[PDB]
Amino acid sequence: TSEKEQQEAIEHIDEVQNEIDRLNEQASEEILKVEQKYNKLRQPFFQKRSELIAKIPNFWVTTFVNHPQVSALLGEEDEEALHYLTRVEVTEFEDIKSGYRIDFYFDENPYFENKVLSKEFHLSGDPSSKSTEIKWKSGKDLTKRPESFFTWFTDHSDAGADELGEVIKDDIWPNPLQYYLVPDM
């Protein structure tokens, strides 16, 4: 093959591979549309699940206590605070890549005045996170002398390496029932 002919072939290959890239980019769009369709399709069922969960005392504290990774993040008084956690929600943003948000809904409690505690994650791919400010009632669990579970809300250094955020989103939220249930004899 000629020295020119090879560079002609390389030019042809580049043109063929641009169309394969186009075909790949169009497939990954169609796939994201399918995820967006089933995100809305599942959301009423998660809505139904939350209502049933809210009639089960200590559901979410128990799931967390029996989870192999999250259990180690809970102190003694953290569990007392999580008693008041009635509802956990996870919301992927529409385009999915943008990021996701996690909501912890609390009943009136001795620790803080917030009705909801949230932590959201954002992505070019520049990982960031931002949380609601916890209005503690002169009983901050993070300024008492182990590190409290609730410091997670004020931690933003890892952002893209937020392990707990990923475990709640990918593991606990899809199926919390496995951890709540304890096999008896």
Q: Does 182 bind a copy of itself (CB under 8 A)?
A: no
CA-to-CA distance for 90 and 133, rounded, in angstroms? 19
Q: Does 96 bind a copy of itself (CB under 8 A)?
A: no
CA-to-CA distance for 184 and 39, rounded, in angstroms? 35
> What residue is closest to Ca ion based on CB?
181
CA-to-CA distance for 77 and 58, rounded, in angstroms? 14
176 contacts 60 by C-beta, under 8 angstroms? yes
To Ca ion, the closest distance from the beta carbon of 178 in angstroms equals 5
Three-class SS state of 50? helix
What part of residues 153-182 is at the interface with Ca ion (CB under 5 A)? 181
163 contacts 68 by C-beta, under 8 angstroms? no
Task: Give me the 31-70 binding string for a copy of itself, x by CB under 8 A, dash otherwise.
Answer: x--xx-xx--xx--xx-xx--xx-xxx-------------
Is 111 exposed, middle or buried, given 0-12, 13-18 or 19+ CB atoms closer than 10 A? buried
Which among 22-30, 78-86, 123-131, 151-159 is the span making contact with a copy of itself, rule CB under 8 A?
22-30
Which among 19-27, 69-77, 86-94, 152-160 is the span making contact with a copy of itself, rule CB under 8 A?
19-27
Among 69, 71, 144, 181, binds a copy of itself (CB under 8 A): 181
What part of residues 141-180 is at the interface with a copy of itself (CB under 8 A)? 174-175, 177
Three-class SS state of 150? helix
Kindly list the residues in this chain that would bind Ca ion in the complex (CB under 5 A). 181
